[PDB]
Amino acid sequence: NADFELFRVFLEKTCGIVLGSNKQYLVSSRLNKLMEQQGIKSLGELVQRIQTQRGGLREMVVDAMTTNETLWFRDTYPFEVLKQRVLPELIKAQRLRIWSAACSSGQEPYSLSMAIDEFEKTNLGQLKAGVQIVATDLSGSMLTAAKAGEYDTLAMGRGLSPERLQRYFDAKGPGRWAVKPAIRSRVEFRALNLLDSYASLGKFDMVFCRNVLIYFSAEVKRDILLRIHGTLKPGGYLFLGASEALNNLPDHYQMVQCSPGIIYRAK
Amino acid sequence: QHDERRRFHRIAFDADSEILQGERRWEVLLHDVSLHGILVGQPQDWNGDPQRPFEARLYLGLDVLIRMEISLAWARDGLLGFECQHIDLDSISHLRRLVELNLGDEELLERELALLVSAHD
Numbered sequence: 251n252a253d254f255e256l257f258r259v260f261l262e263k264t265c266g267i268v269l270g271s272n273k274q275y276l277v278s279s280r281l282n283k284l285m286e287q288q289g290i291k292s293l294g295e296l297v298q299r300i301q302t303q304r305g306g307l308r309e310m311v312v313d314a315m316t317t318n319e320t321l322w323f324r325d326t327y328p329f330e331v332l333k334q335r336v337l338p339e340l341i342k343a344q345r346l347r348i349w350s351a352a353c354s355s356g357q358e359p360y361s362l363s364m365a366i367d368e369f370e371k372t373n374l375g376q377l378k379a380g381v382q383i384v385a386t387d388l389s390g391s392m393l394t395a396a397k398a399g400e401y402d403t404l405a406m407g408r409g410l411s412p413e414r415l416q417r418y419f420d421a422k423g424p425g426r427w428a429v430k431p432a433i434r435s436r437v438e439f440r441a442l443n444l445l446d447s448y449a450s451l452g453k454f455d456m457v458f459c460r461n462v463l464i465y466f467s468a469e470v471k472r473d474i475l476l477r478i479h480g481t482l483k484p485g486g487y488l489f490l491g492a493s494e495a496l497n498n499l500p501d502h503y504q505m506v507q508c509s510p511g512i513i514y515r516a517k
Numbered sequence: 518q519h520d521e522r523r524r525f526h527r528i529a530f531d532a533d534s535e536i537l538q539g540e541r542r543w544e545v546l547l548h549d550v551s552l553h554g555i556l557v558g559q560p561q562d563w564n565g566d567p568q569r570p571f572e573a574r575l576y577l578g579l580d581v582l583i584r585m586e587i588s589l590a591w592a593r594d595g596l597l598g599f600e601c602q603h604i605d606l607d608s609i610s611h612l613r614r615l616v617e618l619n620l621g622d623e624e625l626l627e628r629e630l631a632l633l634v635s636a637h638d
């Protein structure tokens with residue numbers, strides 16, 4: 251496609267970004283939002299409008315093109331651990347508070363809300379008091395789209411069973427789906443700088459902070475982990491990414507073996 | 518030069534890193550990263566041709582890799598400063614995530630992207 255090839259030229263010429271010739275689908279998904287608000291009806295018109303050079307349109311295009319979205323029910327097993335071990339452990343004891351840190355486009359906090367709902371439907375009113383998921387990231391368009399809870403075909407085409415799609419999403423016209431409002435109501439989105447104090451967050455039974463600490467230095471990530479520990483109720487659990495180990499905090503965190511994977515108990 | 522203004526904010530960072538050129542490969546200690554370059558320690562047996570491009574590989578954890586084509590900007594007293602030249606979309610997306618999280622303000626990231634896209638205006 252000629253318009254798409256011209257867009258590849260733009261990304262290389264302006265920013266040195268090398269876009270593969272196999273990513274027409276990814277370009278359409280990442281620029282859908284921006285083209286809508288800008289009144290641009292085609293990629294070809296976008297390519298014309300971005301020659302220039304004045305204004306902030308070129309920045310907005312590079313902004314949208316360099317935002318990664320997270321995955322639904324990432325790695326599967328942490329949500330099985332949540333429903334099969336952690337939630338039964340906590341019931342043997344009070345409103346549930348879960349922190350989804352650096353929630354990005356919202357797939358994880360909404361996945362948690364669906365997993366909670368699945369547990370509540372197979373386990374009575376055992377969660378007597380209710381559940382609150384606090385999802386945080388930097389303010390901006392990515393956190394704003396998370397709050398909206400709307401997702402396109404690319405985002406929905408992976409990691410979501412047809413059972414969960416029919417049960418938890420509302421179709422919103424061609425190629426868009428929205429998380430059902432009952433599922434969204436469980437989640438509260440907040441703007442938070444992970445480098446700042448967590449005092450306003452209160453206390454959590456669980457913290458999900460997955461594939462985020464890799465973006466910080468060894469000293470900064472240790473401080474974040476130390477301050478995350480301050481937000482956990484005694485015996486609360488911290489979930490990291492599937493390939494993430496917790497380094498140099500043996501007095502604060504105890505590794506707990508799951509089937510499979512691990513979680514960290516706050517000591 | 519001391520009158521020039523730095524375009525991009527530099528972030529202290531220590532991920533496992535390598536530098537490549539042709540068939541050569543050096544493990545290097547990373548010192549800082551930015552949206553448009555890196556600072557590394559000069560390794561042993563540094564016969565890297567400064568007039569030809571290099572490649573940097575930054576290993577973020579176990580399963581995230583930031584890859585960039587780099588040019589040697591300066592070298593002195595055991596340090597090597599590199600400027601980013603070409604970078605694949607996934608690598609710059611991880612780099613943008615790193616920069617925005619360490620700046621703590623999305624608008625500061627937007628201003629960095631504005632300087633990146635207008636660098637060759």
Ligand SMILES: Nc1nc2c(ncn2[C@@H]2O[C@@H]3COP(=O)(O)O[C@H]4[C@@H](O)[C@H](n5cnc6c(=O)[nH]c(N)nc65)O[C@@H]4COP(=O)(O)O[C@H]3[C@H]2O)c(=O)[nH]1
Pocket residue numbers: 518519520521522523590591593598
């Ligand atoms: N050719 C080149 N060399 C670089 C660059 N960045 C760092 N260096 C080298 O690394 C030394 C230390 O940099 P520094 O720790 O950032 O600490 C620097 C820095 O903090 C500050 N500084 C000097 N010039 C500038 C500048 O143009 N912009 C900014 N933001 N700071 C500067 O003064 C300190 C000492 O500067 P130097 O004596 O010049 O010595 C500098 C310089 O020799 C670069 O982009 N290009």
Ligand SMILES: Nc1nc2c(ncn2[C@@H]2O[C@@H]3COP(=O)(O)O[C@H]4[C@@H](O)[C@H](n5cnc6c(=O)[nH]c(N)nc65)O[C@@H]4COP(=O)(O)O[C@H]3[C@H]2O)c(=O)[nH]1
Pocket residue numbers: 518519521522523524525527528549550551552553554555556590591598599600601
């Ligand atoms: N992450 C990272 N990237 C690096 C580092 N050093 C250089 N770069 C990248 O290489 C670009 C070119 O550096 P330059 O050609 O020496 O030309 C530089 C240099 O001449 C001057 N400059 C800036 N800072 C210093 C400094 O601390 N000392 C001296 N002597 N010159 C400096 O300003 C020019 C532009 O600086 P930049 O806009 O920053 O753009 C820099 C920067 O993006 C580094 O230690 N870390």
